[PDB]
Amino acid sequence: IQKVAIITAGGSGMGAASARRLAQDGFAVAILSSSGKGEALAKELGGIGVTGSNQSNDDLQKLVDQTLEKWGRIDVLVNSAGHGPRAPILEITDEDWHKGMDTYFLNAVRPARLVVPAMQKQKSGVIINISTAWAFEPSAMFPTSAVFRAGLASFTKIFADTYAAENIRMNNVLPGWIDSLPTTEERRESVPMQRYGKSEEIAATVSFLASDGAAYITGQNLRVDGGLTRSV
Amino acid sequence: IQKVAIITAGGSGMGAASARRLAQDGFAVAILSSSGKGEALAKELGGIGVTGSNQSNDDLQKLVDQTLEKWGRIDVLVNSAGRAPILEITDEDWHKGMDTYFLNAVRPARLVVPAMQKQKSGVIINISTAWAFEPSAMFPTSAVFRAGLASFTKIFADTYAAENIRMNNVLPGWIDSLPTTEERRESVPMQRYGKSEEIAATVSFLASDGAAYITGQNLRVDGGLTRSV
Amino acid sequence: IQKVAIITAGGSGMGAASARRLAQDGFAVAILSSSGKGEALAKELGGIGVTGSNQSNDDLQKLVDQTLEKWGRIDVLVNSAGHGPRAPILEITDEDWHKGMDTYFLNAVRPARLVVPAMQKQKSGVIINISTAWAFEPSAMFPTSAVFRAGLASFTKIFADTYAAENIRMNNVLPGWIDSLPTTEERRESVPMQRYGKSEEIAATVSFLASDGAAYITGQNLRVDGGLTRSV
Amino acid sequence: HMTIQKVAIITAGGSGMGAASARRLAQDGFAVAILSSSGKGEALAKELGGIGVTGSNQSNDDLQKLVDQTLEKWGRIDVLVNSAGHGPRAPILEITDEDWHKGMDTYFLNAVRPARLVVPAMQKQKSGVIINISTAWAFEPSAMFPTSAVFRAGLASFTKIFADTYAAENIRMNNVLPGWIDSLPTTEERRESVPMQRYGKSEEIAATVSFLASDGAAYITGQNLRVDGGLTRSV
């Protein structure tokens, strides 16, 4: 067996960085992206791609089925995310809250349901979600992101307790300001380390969590933020 | 000044207990419930009541409008609320969970804040769960969306602090609004369930001037159940 | 039942405010302070005072013995604190770290040891420590305070678990900027509520925690800080 | 010669998780310097092609000797890993004032003391990592390990202040918080309390230390990472 990694929202940013690093580590990769970039990248990394939505159970099933048809196993699932509603806290509509849940919570839950049967058969698996350093120290800048990634942390803990005995782990990586988007001086200066994080630094964190050496870590939320957040 | 409290899901359990205690404290009370029990309780307490859904903006607006027509202010809002394997919960179930345990607080908050802004004074207290940050399989949608509620609460608190409008959550452990099991009771270091009245007392404190410098907090009332500092 | 409260470091600041409020609530009061202020306050409130140190075994035992001789019970212990070492984080010497521990940790622990026997006989008791809102979001401004109050929280949890079955509770109140000291504009403006807290607000939180209504609360750390800290 | 030979100091590195960390860092390519109160420290350092001092992780003098010998030999300190011995255990009110002070030396100043001594080299380097082996019980404390939990919660707050103070100089500090690890004898009761139904390996703690000592983890600072098989309850 070559080990296998599926990456949802893997066509750009932190998803793409994670897919590249996991391929470099030696995983066969399967990528889902609503852009064409996902399939180009999977091609370049020698793996497979599906072009579809991380909100669609059917695109997801196609991705999972193709990965199992080809390699017969799924060792790692990495879930990255899009961008959800941003507005003043009482102005976000009920509809927008629902859309935020789709973007930032069910984007991780939906594919988790579909990969777990393989991981149960294997008695081995890792699921890593890209969350946000603001989950427990939320800001008005990113209200639906923080709300639903806090909820994702609770989901992650219930999941971790439910599947621990089957050697299946789930952890979240909580990035601060990352150079996947343009920097501002105010934001950069607000980080004690006085720089944005590299998308490759997030990918390195994913790589660790996907390795045998991290096997005893489950249910955790690891902030990778140059010291930005205040809580121990 | 006769101060005013609105209680959503105040027909039974911790909502009813909160409504009774706030009435005893001297607040005028307006109560929403879907069963009808909220109206019967309001009448007993000398207040007003609406029977409707805490997921419906129209029934909520009716409660708010009637309260402001009667007493001209809203000092306090208390939001109270109504098991499956973690991967078996459907997308539809998660969305329903969010309506039930997250938007139940958010929807009435939007409608009371204007009065609170005019008053330069207001308190919103949400009844959450001690399982929010230490969740278990027993209360999955509740815990997930109450963790989300905490993050909402902090953004809200930051947004409205300068206008003297505060939001806090009370996080109950095992409370006597339901029957005990011995395993549950024994898991609590205090070796007893909490009283609905003890939750209501914590609500009362958070509705008082003495608590005015508390905002954005999640206060566990659980007999020592949860493990975290 | 005439209930009884002991307050350590109760001569001024949040300690004195707590003693005044608990007297107003109807408690008999006993006060320890290194200042003459403690005794003047106790005498006013019809209670008893010892002039002495919350680091001295002899002074504390005297306090406790005189309280039990007078009223036969101890229902509430409130521990306020003085001021400990403040310096750049690596310049604080081993000796200063040990002094900080005495000032901010052992100040609470020492009296707790001495009042628990009465509380056990009573099958009822409450201990409330005045801590700091910076305990888990520490600031270089108050390094020994934050370090030892974070320590205090873990002590408080072990205590709460050990004595819960005997109906003896311990909780900590974590103030932000309080008007026991003069404001600075920068500090005041950093608080979302745009004001310092009142000592009377801290005392009201102490009052609630000493009440029957709070009887199901134990092991907790309650921030009273106008929204200053960032963590949920 | 064409690539920097990075250097790691391990305190209490003679056995258990400290020795595991030493071994792994050496395997990663670090030159290792080990302090241990037993001869185990030096023997292990010999095996790993490094240096060792026999002495106490509570003694400024012995720590200064290791640091000096390290800088004398390799000219730099890139990584400091602080493990710990064992402190007082007793019912919570039975721990004497003296036992609390001893606990502080064992679980808090064991990290602080060497941190003070390695930071100047790290500042000259504009690069450094300090990793303390703490405990999963720090914020979910148990009556089993009272001084450990108290002072490791304290260590977290120290760590955050340190991290804010030195972040601009690219010097980071993080804590690894192990649960039940196979460095000590196992019991069934403890094993079955862990959701993963096994103890952690010392090698899994060392793997976490290795990651945190690597360039990949450079944007992580001030954190407490629990490695506990899901034992602790908090998100």
Nearest to B210 by CA among C6, C21, C217: C21
User: What is the strand order of the sheet C76-79 is part of?
Assistant: C48-51, C28-33, C4-8, C76-79, C125-130, C168-175, C221-224
Q: Do A229 and C230 touch (CB under 8 A)?
A: yes
Q: Bridge-partner residues for D172, per DSSP?
A: D129
Helices A106-122, A57-71: inter-axial angle, 10-degree rounding: 30
Query: Please, are residues D161 and D221 in contact by the beta-carbon 8 Å criterion?
Result: no
- The structure tokens listed for D63 are 């720590």
Give the one of C204, C221, C225 whose C-beta lies nearest to B210's C-beta: C204
Taking the C-alpha atoms of residue D44 and residue D20, their distance in angstroms, rounded to an integer, is 10
**All chains having 3 or more CB pairs closer than 8 angstroms to chain A:** B, C, D
Phi, psi (deg, nearest 5) at residue D218:
-55, -30
Residue located via tokens 């750049």: C88
Q: Is C138 exposed, middle or buried (0-12, 13-18, 19+ CB in 10 A)?
A: buried
Question: Of the candidates A35, A29, A25, which has an alpha carbon nearest to the alpha carbon of residue A6?
Answer: A29
User: Which residues in A have their CB inside 8 Å of a CB on B?
Assistant: 57, 88-90, 94, 97-98, 101, 105-106, 109-110, 112-113, 116, 135-140, 143, 146-148, 150-151, 153-155, 157-159, 161-162
Of A89, C142, C178, which Cα lies nearest the Cα of B216? A89
What spatial distance separates the first Cα and last Cα of chain B, rounded to whole Å? 39
Asked if D32 and D45 count as a contact pair (C-beta separation under 8 A), the reply is yes
In the sheet with B76-79, reading across from the earlier edge strand, the strands are B48-51, B28-33, B4-8, B76-79, B122-127, B165-172, B218-221
Give chain C as a 3 state SS string: CCCEEEEECCCCHHHHHHHHHHHHHCCEEEEEECCCHHHHHHHHCCCEEEECCCCCHHHHHHHHHHHHHHHCCCCEEEECCCCCCCCCCCCCCHHHHHHHHHHHHHHHHHHHHHHHHHHHHHCCEEEEEECCCCCCCCCCCCHHHHHHHHHHHHHHHHHHHHHHHHCEEEEEEEECCECCCCCCHHHHHHCCCCCCECHHHHHHHHHHHCCHHHCCCCCCEEEECCCCCCCC
Evaluate whether A173 touches A206 at the Cβ level (below 8 Å). yes
**Other Cβ atoms within 10 Å of A106 Cβ, number:** 21
Judge contact between A212 and D209, C-beta under 8 A.
no
Kindly identify which residue of chain A lies nearest to residue D218, measuring between CA atoms: A201
Contact between chains at D220 and A214 (C-beta distance less than 8 A): no
Q: D1-235 has which CATH code?
A: 3.40.50.720
Instruction: Tell me whether residues D108 and C88 touch, CB distance under 8 A.
Output: no
Separation CA B50–CA B7 (nearest Å): 11
Provide φ and ψ at D34, rounded to 5°: -120, 130
Residue A146: list chain B partners with CB under 8 A. 151, 155
CA distance A194 to D172: 13
Contact (CB<8Å) C112/D93: yes
Contact criterion met (CB < 8 Å) for B91 and A110: yes
Query: Which amino acid, C66?
Result: Q
C106 vs D contacts (CB less than 8 Å): 97, 100
Provide φ and ψ at C147, rounded to 5°: -50, -50
Which residue type does B1 have?
Answer: I
Superfamily classification of domain B1-229? NAD(P)-binding Rossmann-like Domain (3.40.50.720)
d(CA B145, CA A151) in angstroms, rounded, equals 6
Q: CA-nearest residue of chain B to C161?
A: B189
Measured distance CA(D6)–CA(D33) in Å, rounded: 11
How far apart CA B202 and CA C220 sit, in angstroms, is 13
- The length of chain A in residues reads 232
Strand partners, B165: B122
> How many Å apart are CA D215 and CA D206, to the nearest integer?
16
Which of A160, A192, A211 is closest, CB to CB, to D168? A192
Strands D79-82 and D51-54: unpaired
Query: How far apart are alpha carbons B111 and B46 in whole angstroms?
Result: 23
Would you say how long chain B is, in residues? 229
Q: Exposed e or buried b for every residue in A180-203, given b needs 16+ CB within 10 A?
A: beeeeeeeeeebbbebbbbbbbbb
Question: What is each CA distance from D151 to B124, C98, C127, in whole angstroms?
Answer: 37, 12, 21
Within 8 A of D159 by CB-CB distance, chain A residues are 232
Residues forming beta bridges with residue A78, ordered by sequence position: A7, A128
**Contact list, B211 vs chain C (CB under 8 Å):** 201, 204-205, 208
Query: Which amino acid is it at C92?
Result: I
Candidate from B161, B195, B210 with C-beta closest to C201 = B210
Q: Which of A179, A209, A194 is nearest to A79 (CA)?
A: A209
Residue A221 DSSP SS3:
strand
Here the tokens at position C61 are: 């035992």
Strand order in the sheet with A125-130: A48-51, A28-33, A4-8, A76-79, A125-130, A168-175, A221-224
Angle at the Cα of A157 (from A153 to A159), degrees rounded to 5?
A: 115
Burial class (CB in 10 A: 0-12, 13-18, 19+), C24: exposed
Amino acid at D66: L
Strand bridging mode C76-79 / C125-130: parallel
Distance of alpha carbon C182 from alpha carbon A231, whole angstroms:
26
Q: For residue A72, how far is the Cα from the chain centroid?
A: 22
Type of residue at B55: Q
Confirm if B67 and B115 have CB atoms less than 8 A apart. Answer: no
Left if phi > 0, otherwise alpha if psi is -120 to 50, otherwise beta: which for B156? alpha
Residue D153 neighbours by CB under 8 Å, 6+ apart = B229, C150, C151, C153, C154, D138, D139, D141
DSSP code for D197:
S
Radius of gyration of chain C (CA): 17
The amino acid at residue D14 is G
Neighbours of B82 (CB within 10 A): 15
| β partners of residue A51 | A33
How many angstroms separate the CA atoms of C97 and D113, rounded? 11
Neighbours of B152 (CB within 10 A): 28
What's the 3-state SS for chain B? CCCEEEEECCCCHHHHHHHHHHHHHCCEEEEEECCCHHHHHHHHCCCEEEECCCCCHHHHHHHHHHHHHHHCCCCEEEECCCCCCCCCCCHHHHHHHHHHHCHHHHHHHHHHHHHHHHHCCEEEEEECCCCCCCCCCCCHHHHHHHHHHHHHHHHHHHHHHHHCEEEEEEEECCECCCCCCHHHHHHCCCCCCECHHHHHHHHHHHCCHHHCCCCCCEEEECCCCCCCC
CATH number of C1-232: 3.40.50.720
Question: How buried is residue A45: exposed, middle or buried, by Cβ count under 10 Å (0-12/13-18/19+)?
Answer: buried
| C160 with B189: Cβ contact below 8 A | yes
Q: Which two tokens stand for residue D114?
A: 């060497």
What residues form DSSP beta bridges with A172? A129, A221
Which string of DSSP letters, residue by residue, matches D98-113?
A: HHHHHHHHHHTHHHHH
According to DSSP H, which parts of D48-96 are helical? 60-74
Classify the phi-psi angles of A35: left when phi > 0, otherwise alpha if psi is within -120 to 50, otherwise beta: beta
Residues forming beta bridges with residue D129, ordered by sequence position: D79, D172
Q: Distance between CA atoms of C8 and B92, rounded to whole angstroms? A: 56
- Please indicate whether, in this complex, the C-beta atoms of B195 and C216 are within 8 angstroms of each other: yes
Q: How far apart are CA D71 and CA A224, in angstroms?
A: 31
Q: Identity (one letter) of the amino acid at B167? A: M
Supply D72's token pair. 């004398």
- For residues A45 and C205, give the distance between their C-alpha atoms in angstroms, rounded to a whole number: 60
Enter the DSSP assignment of A136.
S
CA dihedral D104, D110, D115, D121 (to 10 degrees): 160
Taking the C-alpha atoms of residue B224 and residue B229, their distance in angstroms, rounded to an integer, is 10
Give the number of C-alpha atoms closer than 13 A to the C-alpha of residue C14, restricted to the C-beta side.
29
Phi, psi of C18 (to 5 degrees): -65, -45
Report chain C residues touching chain D, CB-CB < 8 A.
Answer: 88-90, 94, 97-98, 101, 105-106, 109-110, 112-113, 116, 135-140, 143, 146-148, 150-155, 157-159, 161-162
- Cβ atoms within 10 A of the Cβ of B135, count? 29
Residue closest to D80 by CA, chosen among D220, D212, D231: D212
Distance from CA of D160 to the nearest CA of A (A): 6
DSSP class of A19: H
Amino acid letter, B15: G
In whole angstroms, how far apart are CA B5 and each of A36, C161, D205?
A: 54, 36, 53
Using DSSP, how many helices (H) and how many strands (E) does chain D show? Answer: 8, 7
Q: Token match 């020492």: residue?
A: C110
Do the Cβ atoms of C170 and C156 come closer than 8 Å?
A: yes
Angle at C222 between CA B108 and CA B167, to 5 degrees: 15
Residue C35: CB atoms within 10 Å: 14
